[PDB]
Ligand SMILES: C[C@@]1(C(=O)NCc2ccccc2)CN(C2COC2)CCN1
Ligand SMILES: [Cl-]
Ligand SMILES: [Cl-]
Ligand SMILES: [Cl-]
Ligand SMILES: [Cl-]
């Protein structure tokens with residue numbers, strides 16, 4: 001057990017191992033974050049103190065979920081866990097959880113500058129490489145958007161902030177909804193990992209044009225922007241929408257054909273246009289997958305099928321389990337004390 005030291009930073013008490021130095025507050029509903037220098041590894045790191053991690057069954061399960069997911073992710077294009085600690089010496093006094101990751105500077109917003117087509121190729125390639133890994137473990141990110149993509153000086157990219165959002169957060173003219181697939185925006189059906197590919201299409205379009213693809217002022221305005229581009233659904237997709245009310249609403253709209261994407265994305269690489277047509281498909285069954293997209297000719301200069309790894313299997317059976325707060329807390333404690341740091 002390392003030696004811990006205490007200090008008060010912006011009205012909260014932080015108790016952390018001596019290896020973490022020069023703590024400086026950076027941000028704050030799920031917890032507070034400080035930047036620090038890790039004297040053991042030489043990295044600049046982000047230290048997150050969870051706020052009220054075991055206040056309810058829902059909150060305790062969410063704490064366990066986040067720790068399990070972060071401990072599993074080991075990929076160049078996905079955020080990983082450098083450390084996790086608690087100052088508690090036993091389960092009986094266990095109350096606080098701290099998570100440590102590489103400190104990230106800019107996100108794709110702070111670049112979306114002047115992007116060449118070669119820049120778009122490299123950025124989208126890295127997102128898809130990370131997504132092939134995530135999806136191979138049957139994990140769905142569910143919240144991909146430019147603010148959840150970190151980029152460094154050399155245009156190297158990491159996916160962060162997995163979906164672990166409320167009604168107010170998704171209301172109105174808000175970027176929190178502009179990248180969401182329509183079947184999850186409107187609860188049409190049970191969704192799957194194809195929702196993340198819709199988000200990648202929205203992001204790629206924005207990198208090519210400098211503009212949000214579907215900046216709707218509310219759910220219905222956004223749906224109208226989507227259907228004007230990709231066309232209204234045919235009977236085949238309509239059969240798959242489980243809400244009779246949502247089906248009824250869609251059929252009240254006048255039918256529209258899919259637009260010509262070469263006349264929307266004027267002057268773009270024809271191979272980029274082709275890939276966008278394969279991502280932005282209304283029927284999620286028919287979208288290109290991450291593994292298929294990596295083999296698309298648009299990425300010819302970066303694709304290497306010997307260097308696009310998959311994940312170890314991931315057991316999510318806890319998600320259907322019903323437990324008491326203290327049982328979720330004990331499972332979290334075991335995962336804290338069994339953590340093994342990366343090489
Ligand atoms: C895609 C779009 C755009 O940003 N167009 C500008 C552009 C800039 C560079 C290269 C090509 C195109 C167009 N609007 C209208 C709606 O249907 C076309 C929808 C969203 N933004
Ligand atoms: Cl230490
Ligand atoms: Cl990382
Ligand atoms: Cl504690
Ligand atoms: Cl964003």
Ligand SMILES: [Cl-]
Nearest residue numbers: 253254255256
């Ligand atoms: Cl019609």
Ligand SMILES: [Cl-]
Nearest residue numbers: 313314315316
């Ligand atoms: Cl597992």
Ligand SMILES: [Mg+2]
Nearest residue numbers: 147148160161
């Ligand atoms: Mg975020």
